[PDB]
């Protein structure tokens, strides 16, 4: 079943035994309806052709990592309707299962609906003289408006509604974008994917302003922080998001996106007593 744990902001769905071709089921098609908000995660464990009783299983859309079924109808890149979404689709060669994780961005501008179909109707198992076919499961997902824009820096110009600062990048730019945030306020940035992001996988490592811009892992500065990152989405952009909660130590750090002719620095100051 699909369950949303309101405490972890995570919706988990397991679509394996519901579509197995070895078990008997009343309904050939079952529907799940889930509503998500900004920063929620959707984790779906589903099978592959390599798992017994799922030899002819398939997903719709086939490119599940990049696409959804917009309006339960046509297969579209999720980046087009949910700007800034982050998807991963990782295979487990032991259990023959795949895990799909969708991160809703820290702000959603437009209410959206889409669906995903896990179709095992073509797989079959032989029991005695009977041939039993697998079944189908559909997930209908709804995303609400995102409440607040990210106090951050869009260096691409393509995420103007997602960030408080957004500017198209010209040659010979050398811009520094400053941000002060308190607890439970999102920051982040977007760059061209071919630009060089320094340090590696910001904010996973950052230049610590307090210690002479030395490179440090973020978790060697705070364990009261959540982050996410995508190196290259389907539109060719790099994005990173960060948020603190219940962190009392003050922080000051930065990161850079640099091409052969331009530099873009984001400088974040986290003050646990800053009031907007």
């Amino acid at each position, epitope marked *: 079943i699909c369950k949303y744990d309101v405490t972890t902001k995570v919706a988990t769905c397991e679509i394996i035994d519901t579509i197995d071709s070895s078990v008997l089921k009343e309904h050939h098609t079952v529907h799940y309806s889930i509503t998500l908000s900004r920063w929620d995660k959707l984790i779906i464990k589903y099978p592959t052709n390599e798992k017994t009783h799922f030899e002819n299983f398939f997903v719709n859309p086939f490119n599940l990592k990049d696409k959804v079924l917009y309006n339960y109808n046509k297969p579209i890149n999720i980046e087009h309707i949910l700007p800034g979404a982050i998807t991963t689709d990782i295979y487990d060669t032991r259990t023959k299962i795949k895990q799909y994780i969708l991160r809703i961005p820290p702000y959603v*501008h437009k209410d959206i609906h889409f669906s995903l179909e896990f179709n095992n109707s073509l797989s079959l198992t032989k029991q005695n003289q009977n041939i039993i076919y697998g079944n189908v499961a559909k997930i209908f997902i709804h995303i609400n*408006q*995102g409440y*607040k824009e990210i*106090h951050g820096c869009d260096f691409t110009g393509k995420y103007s*509604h997602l960030f408080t*600062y*957004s500017k198209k990048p010209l040659p010979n730019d050398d811009d520094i974008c400053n941000v002060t945030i308190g607890n439970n306020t999102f920051s982040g940035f977007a760059c061209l994917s071919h630009f060089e992001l320094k340090p590696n996988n910001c904010f996973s490592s950052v230049y610590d302003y307090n210690e002479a811009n030395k490179v440090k892992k973020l978790f060697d500065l705070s364990t009261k922080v959540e982050l996410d990152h995508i190196k290259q989405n389907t539109s060719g952009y790099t994005l990173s998001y960060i948020i603190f909660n219940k962190e009392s130590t003050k922080l000051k750090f930065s990161c850079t996106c640099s091409s052969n002719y331009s530099n873009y620095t984001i400088r974040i100051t986290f003050d646990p007593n800053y009031i907007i």
Partner: nanobody, 123 residues
Framework: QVQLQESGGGLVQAGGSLRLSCAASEHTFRDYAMGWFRQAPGKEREFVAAISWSGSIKYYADSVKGRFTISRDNAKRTQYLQMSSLKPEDTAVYYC?????????????????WGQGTQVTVS
């Protein structure tokens, strides 16, 4: 956001209040950052306030910080400016304006679309 129209504007005491509204009948109002400017007699038009498209992030000018409040209803496609503790220098023609984000901070000019303006007098 093509059609912007203000409502409100009159006379107040030297410590009273007034409230301006700005309406746009167009759906794309949802996508524009909203703002208020004022122009005094024979003075360059100055920035008053601005609110983001989400309605959650506001930015005020130092001249009005602490007395003026901006907000918006995206369903009705309206925005409002509650002006309290009005002062004789606050006398001006107030216009509302919308801008598509980009080119820097969201609240920073240039603003794209404008209204016709409503007069506000205090004494």
């Amino acid at each position: 956001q093509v059609q912007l129209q203000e409502s409100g504007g009159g006379l107040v005491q030297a410590g009273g209040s007034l409230r301006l509204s700005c309406a746009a009948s167009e759906h794309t109002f949802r996508d524009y950052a909203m703002g208020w400017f004022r122009q005094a007699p024979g003075k360059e038009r100055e920035f008053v306030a601005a609110i983001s498209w989400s309605g959650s992030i506001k930015y005020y000018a130092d001249s009005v910080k602490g007395r003026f409040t901006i907000s918006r209803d995206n369903a009705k496609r309206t925005q409002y400016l509650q002006m309290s503790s009005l002062k004789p220098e606050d006398t001006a023609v107030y216009y509302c304006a919308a801008r598509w984000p980009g080119g820097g901070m969201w609240y920073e000019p240039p603003y794209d679309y404008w209204g016709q303006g409503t007069q506000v007098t205090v004494s």
